Each structure stands twice: as structure tokens, then as C-alpha cells.
Amino acid sequence: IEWDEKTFTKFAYLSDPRTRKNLVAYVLTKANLESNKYENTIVIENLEDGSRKFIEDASMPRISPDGKKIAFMRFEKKTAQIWVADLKTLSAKKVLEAKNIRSIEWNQDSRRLLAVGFKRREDEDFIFEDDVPAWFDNMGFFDGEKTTFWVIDTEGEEVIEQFEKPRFSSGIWHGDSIVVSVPHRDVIPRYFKYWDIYLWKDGEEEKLFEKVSFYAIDSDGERILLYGKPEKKYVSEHDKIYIYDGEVKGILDDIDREVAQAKIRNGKVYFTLFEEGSVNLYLWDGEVREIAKGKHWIMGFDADERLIYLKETATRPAELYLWDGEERQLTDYNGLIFKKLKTFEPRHFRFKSIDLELDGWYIKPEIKEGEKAPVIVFVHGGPKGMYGYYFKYEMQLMASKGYYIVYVNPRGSNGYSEDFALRVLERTGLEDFQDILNGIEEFLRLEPQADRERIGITGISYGGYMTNWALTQSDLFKAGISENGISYWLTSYAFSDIGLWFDKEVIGDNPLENENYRKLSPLFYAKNVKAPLLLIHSLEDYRCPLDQSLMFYHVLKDLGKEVYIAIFKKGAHGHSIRGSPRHRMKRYKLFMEFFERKLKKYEEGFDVEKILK
């Protein structure tokens, strides 16, 4: 095993942990480069033996409350199928052939499933829209989408109740009722901001909440768990969790950090928080108790009789763990790979920027006492993203190729106070960019072997914006790779999936008259660019549509700049990690070669035919 553009295929990727009784289930995913497909296997472990059994070419494991059965999905006919297996022998029957189903959940009776899906107009030749937005990242054109809710009897194998709601509605069981969360409608739907919440049973409903900034995420049959706030002024405010049983009770009213995920089982709540680069696991049982806190990201968890969770670190993809008073590692899927593959632990540093003290990290490559090394600055997305202790392939890969890697959490990031997150609103490219510069300055001080004359910068999404911006506002950088970014806020407002509300918040109100939409946009400062730039974009990214890269590309070419554009024919906003294996391999090889040829040692041109094959 060596680091290159294919190494990501050698890892086992775990997701969707579930537990009932003495059993754990989860999904093992492999990127198969030869077939160009992801392969999914459900693994069921019996904590009684450490014994494993399998359900092949399947995902979405849902263990029935009684622990007797497992439901799952399989995906010729472009149709999904819901299956049920007995957990003892894993013999299985097909229950329903289920196109456009997004979720499945058991009722407490271990007989009925709730499935939530969607339906669209589906004309062969044209999409027709009369609501907003017209598209959504990783979903496609809405085409008049409505949400569908089906109650499925797994014994008789029939939809026994069904109903529809507006697009982007969700539903959970609450005993024998269904809690339904629907975006609230004003001039447009208030997506990610306000919901109406209903209690549905037997074809009738009652409204529980009107225009609240939380939605229902879980239930234990007596109490409903709510996620968000009673009322947000900004979508960027920290989401919290509340127990509802008649009265709404905050259980983290005093903790100024955002909840990543949360579940309730038997009146206890298990939850994770974004905290200064980590995603940490806690329990609330009347008080908040630490379960798994460290330099790591708790990516998923479940609890029933046992508590299990997936923990990723800066140098290892997720593995599964069990907590019984102390943490026990359950799986070691990548252990043999990693015995042969060098990894680089980031070094944390603090630095001052303006009025704040912030977190940065860096990775130092294998160099000897007399040598200097080039530097890649990475900028995370969001702006309310967060770097720290998750596994970032490009950083390990570039470190292995002789680069320093440097990255910080500027104001606007998740993982800190709410106020720290909100500082970025209407200030994109201002103090946050200064924080990145100040982090780099401190890093250079700490590492005199870092070659100040060969610093590059890269990022995706907000990180792509900031790469664009950096090359227009500073002469520090020798090369840039900007991916799925922003060059012009006004088109983000009006063209992107979330722009109508999110740009109002992050950039400002009255967008057609607000000067900040030009003032804080890289497009308008294109003349300033002096460093070679690679723009990467994908055709199904509706979060940051194509214009954001292609306009910047054309305008930079109109100004005589050295710029290149790679337009991946498939893929949404997250394609760098969710595209097809072969697509992702080609992106990684482009990324590494652009920095080899423009940053480590500049050479003219970029003959992609030669460089890639």
C-alpha cells in the first residue's frame, strides 16, 4: 500500500450503526474502482461472540424493537426494495418495491414501518416548477416534489395508510402516532428556519407547533425530541435539543455549543457536540455526562441496551466502539492497511487574530534538518464548517508527497461559541480571511523549514470562495485550487438551492441593492490575480452552481490570467467524497498534480492528457 490517487479505495468505510439488545448492525462500504461502484454490506455483530453475519448488497439496517428482525433496503429496475429478515438465520423476504423512499423506521410493535419518500411530476421532456427552490443539491430538480408518508405492514406486505405533505417534510413515530414536521410557508417556505409540527394518526392530525425553529428527530413513546431552537433569528445559531411531553424542556440551555446528532431511548438522551475541532459524545440523564471526548469525531451512534458509536480520528477512518463504563474498540477494519501506510498526526497551535485567540493545526512532512518544504493552506467550507480531528484524505496524501499542511478554524466556524459563529455574517472575506492570514503567519514562525516562497491555498465550497478571494486580495500565494466555490454572491442568492434565504443571512438583506454582494465577491477583483488557479466544479452541484466557477474562469481568461477548469460531468456539492470511485480518483490525481506542477516547482501549461495517462 502506497499514497496516491487510488489509496482511498483500499479503506473500509463504516456507517449507520444500530443496536438492539446484544446485537450491533452497521454498513461496510467499499469503493470498487474496477466496477466503478460503491459496494454496501450490512454486518451484524453479536456482542455475545464478536461473531459476524452479513446481508450482502444492502444498506439502511433497522433492527426491530423486539430484536427479532431486521429491515433493510436494496437498490436493474432503478427501484429500491424494502426487505425484512429474521435476525437468527437471516432468511429474508421482499416486502415492498419502493422507488424514492428516503427513510424507514419501525413502529414499537415490530410490525409496521414508516417510510418517507417523495413524488414528482416526471414528464420525460420538461421539469415544471411553481414553488421554490427549483432544485436541491443531491436531490435534483424538484419538479413539483411532494413528501410521501407510508405506513407499511411488514407481515401482510401492504401500505395501510398514506398521505402527502409539502416538499422537505419529515416524520417519525411517536407511539401509534406520527410526528410530522413541515416547513412553514410565508412568501416562500422557510426552509431550515421555521416549521409547523403536527401529530398524525388514522388520517386525522392536530397541530402541535406553529412557526417554530425546531423539528422532531426522535421519540421514546412518551417524550418527543426536538432539534433546533424555539425561535432562531439566524439559521447559523447553534441548534440545540429539547424534550417535549406537554412542556418543552431545553436540556443544554447552559452549554453554548451546537448539537450534531441526538437520540432518546428510555428518557435518556445521547448526543454529540461540535467542540473546538472534535465531535464529542455525551449522555443526558438529568445531568450532562461525558462519554467519548477526545481528539476525534463521533460520526454516528446508537443506544438501546448497549451504547455503540463510530469514532474517526485525523489519521484513521471510523471504526466501531462500545461504551460500558469505559470505551472498548469493537472493530479494526483498516488496522492491517494502516500498519503499512504512514499517517501524519496534526500539531495543534493557538494564535491571536485581531480580538480573538483561535485554533490552527499543521502537518510537517518528512524532511531532514537542512531542507525547506512547500505549504498547502486548506480552508474548510460552511462558513460554519469545522476542521480538526476527522480523516481528511487530501491532507494525508499531500503530507506524504512532501508538503506542509496548514489549516485553522476562523471566526464563523462551528465548534465554539454561538457569537463566534455569527461573527462572519455580512463579513465574508473580512475578519475571517484575516484569521487565516494570521494563522499562517504564526505557523511560519513555528516552522522555519516551511518555505514562505511556496505557499498555496485550496478549499471546497466556502473554502473555494476563500481560495478565490485570497488570490484576489493577497500576493502571498503561489497557486490555488478552488472547488465548487463562490465567485459572485448575487448569483448564489438567485440561482442556488438555498440562496434565497441563506445568502440574505450570510451576505445581507436586499440583495438586488446591497453593495456587499459585489464588494465581497472575488469576481469583481479578478484583475488582481497573479497565481495560477485550477477551478474544479461538478455539474450536479446546486448548492454552488456552475456559474460560480465558470464565470470566474471566463473572466480570468478575458484578463489574460493563467487559469484552468475541470468540470466533472456528474456529482453534487460533495462529489470529492461521494462521486463515483473513478471520478474521485481522477480528481485526486488532478489535485496532486496541479500542486506538484504549480506549487512545489512551477512549470508552464497543464497537459491533462499526458499528466493523467
Q: Which of 155, 154, 179 is nearest to 169 (CA)?
A: 179
In whole angstroms, what is the distance from residue 229 CA to residue 221 CA? 22
End-to-end alpha carbon distance in the chain: 21
559 binds, among Cl ion, Mg ion, its own copies, none (CB under 5 to 8 A by kind): its own copies
Residue from 1, 176, 285, 452 touching its own copies (CB under 8 A): that is 1
Q: Of residues 37, 201, 267, 336, which one binds its own copies by CB under 8 A?
A: 336
Shortest distance (Å) from residue 57 CB to Cl ion: 16
157 is in an annotated binding site: yes
Question: According to the annotation, is 305 in a ligand binding site?
Answer: no
* Window 68-107: residues binding Mg ion (CB under 5 A): 94
Kindly identify the residues of this chain, within the stretch 307-336, that bind Mg ion according to CB under 5 A: none
Query: What string of H, E and C letters represents the secondary structure of 228-286?
Result: EECCCCCCCCCCEEEEECCCEEECCCCCCCCEEEEEEECCEEEEEEEECCEEEEEEECC
By CB under 8 A, residue 577 contacts its own copies: no
At its nearest, how many Å lie between its own copies and the CB of residue 85?
A: 8
Angle of CA points 66, 68, 70, to nearest 5°: 105
Give the closest residue to 112 by CA, choosing from 68, 156, 163. 156
User: With respect to its own copies, which residue has the nearer C-beta, 135 or 351?
Assistant: 135
Q: Write phi, then psi, for 506 (nearest 5 degrees).
A: -80, -35
If one asks whether residue 555 binds its own copies (CB under 8 A), the answer comes out as yes
Which residue in the block uniquely carries the three cell numbers 460560480? Answer: 548
Is 202 or 419 the residue whose CB approaches its own copies more closely? 202
Ligand-binding annotation for 39, yes or no, is yes
Q: Mark residues 120-159: x for contact with Cl ion by CB under 5 A, - for none.
A: -----------------------------------x----
- Distances from the Cα of 360 to the Cα of 299, 480, 571, angstroms: 22, 20, 31
- Which amino acid would we find at residue 310? L
Residue 113 or 479: the one with the smaller Cβ distance to Cl ion is 113
Least CB distance from residue 37 to its own copies, whole Å? 12
What is the C-alpha separation between 182 and 178, in angstroms, rounded? 13
Residue 564 binds which of its own copies, Cl ion, Mg ion, none (CB < 5-8 A, kind-dependent): its own copies
Which of the ranges 84-92, 112-120, 335-343, 451-459 carries the binding residues for Mg ion, by CB under 5 A? 112-120
List CB contacts of 599: < 8 A, sequence separation 6 or more: 374, 376, 403, 454, 456, 478, 479
Q: Which is nearer to its own copies, 38 or 255 (CB)?
A: 38
Question: Among 45, 239, 447, 483, which residue interacts with Mg ion (rule: CB under 5 A)?
Answer: 239
Q: Does 164 bind its own copies (CB under 8 A)?
A: no
Residue 557 in the binding site for its own copies (CB under 8 A): yes
Partner whose binding site includes residue 88, from its own copies, Mg ion, Cl ion, none (CB under 5 to 8 Å by kind)? its own copies
Rounded to whole angstroms, how far apart are CA atoms 596 and 613?
16
Reduce the DSSP state of residue 339 to 3 states and report it: coil
Residue 332 counted as an annotated binding residue = no
By CB under 8 A, residue 127 contacts its own copies:
yes
**DSSP structure class, residue 345:** P
Does 340 bind its own copies (CB under 8 A)? Our answer is yes
Collect all residues with Cβ–Cβ distance below 8 Å to 129 and sequence separation of at least 6: 141, 142, 143, 144
Considering beta carbons, is residue 143 or 451 the nearer one to its own copies? 143
Least Å distance, CB 562 to its own copies, is: 9
483 annotated to a ligand binding site? no
Contact between 253 and Mg ion by CB under 5 A: the answer reads: no
DSSP-based three-state secondary structure for 486: coil
Asked if 380 and 358 count as a contact pair (C-beta separation under 8 A), the reply is no
Q: Is 258 annotated as a binding residue?
A: yes
**Are 395 and 368 spatial neighbours (Cβ–Cβ below 8 Å)?**
no
Residue 433 cell numbers, joined: 480571511
Q: Segment contacting Mg ion (CB under 5 A): 284-292, 362-370, 413-421, 587-595?
A: 413-421
- Contact pick of 72, 192, 553, 588 for its own copies (by CB under 8 A): 553
Sequence ranges of the binding site for Mg(2+): 39, 94, 122, 157, 239, 258, 419
Residues lying near Mg ion in the complex (CB under 5 A) are found at 94, 120, 122, 157, 239, 419
